[PDB]
């Protein structure tokens with residue numbers, strides 16, 4: 001019944017995911033740090049996204065990925081509940097996984113792998129049913145699923161960007177703007193539907209998007225083109241939550 005609903009969501013949402021943020025971890029009661037075991041080898045990584053029967057994990061390069069290859073691309077992971085507890089009660093049993101895919105990328109002169117891992121036995125049903133509900137909301141595009149990061153003294157310190165200064169380009173002209181908020185999928189900027197390019201100085205990152213709201217200086221809401229978002233931007237937002 002619950003099992004059946006989870007099987008239906010598995011089929012419906014094959015290939016889809018929910019990116020992690022503070023509010024998602026809170027809802028799911030799932031810590032974002034996770035231990036992988038490959039025989040007696042062990043390493044901690046961070047969850048990037050979760051799906052109905054798989055999840056994506058970030059590790060440093062030259063750690064888990066070669067270790068998995070030596071073990072026929074099988075390992076086990078331990079999900080923990082969203083607390084600092086060291087009690088047995090905070091942990092789910094280790095679950096068997098198999099590596100489906102991996103990519104390589106850079107951050108701050110350090111190299112990382114993003115690993116897609118499939119559960120070889122049922123994920124905890126309490127988590128699976130909530131991931132399916134989040135995927136229903138993502139499909140609908142009727143309400144927000146993630147928090148937006150408001151740009152202020154505290155968040156600018158945590159984000160790996162230097163300031164609130166950015167640029168908006170549209171109709172062959174580039175204007176200054178101030179970033180007011182950021183999220184995985186867009187931004188609100190202030191300055192003085194249309195296609196545009198949002199950019200800011202970084203290690204200039206350019207993101208193509210479309211206007212969604214304007215209101216009066218002018219506050220402009222932007223939806224980044226969903227299939228084109230630079231991995232470096234996505235990881236900047238993920239880093240903020242981690």
Ligand SMILES: Nc1nc2c(ncn2[C@@H]2O[C@@H]3COP(=O)(O)O[C@H]4[C@@H](O)[C@H](n5cnc6c(=O)[nH]c(N)nc65)O[C@@H]4COP(=O)(O)O[C@H]3[C@H]2O)c(=O)[nH]1
Pocket residue numbers: 142143144212213221
């Ligand atoms: N198309 C589009 N327009 C957007 C989007 N984000 C903001 N806006 C526009 O900007 C207005 C201000 O949004 P806010 O200051 O975040 O203030 C919002 C926010 O606090 C809240 N709100 C509305 N929808 C949601 C939602 O799905 N989730 C959450 N958490 N808050 C929401 O209600 C307030 C007023 O909402 P509105 O009267 O609708 O007024 C919204 C709406 O016209 C977006 O993703 N898409």
Ligand SMILES: Nc1nc2c(ncn2[C@@H]2O[C@@H]3COP(=O)(O)O[C@H]4[C@@H](O)[C@H](n5cnc6c(=O)[nH]c(N)nc65)O[C@@H]4COP(=O)(O)O[C@H]3[C@H]2O)c(=O)[nH]1
Pocket residue numbers: 141142143144145146148149181182183184185186187188212213220221222223224
């Ligand atoms: N940081 C930031 N991102 C922005 C802003 N405006 C749009 N976006 C981004 O653009 C995505 C798609 O906007 P939508 O197509 O209007 O699709 C929106 C819209 O239909 C609705 N929605 C969300 N918030 C509001 C709101 O305040 N008011 C209204 N009327 N609808 C909202 O829910 C859908 C999904 O919202 P999200 O998952 O947040 O996904 C939003 C968000 O990632 C902005 O002011 N700041």
Ligand SMILES: [Cl-]
Pocket residue numbers: 017018019184
């Ligand atoms: Cl997502």
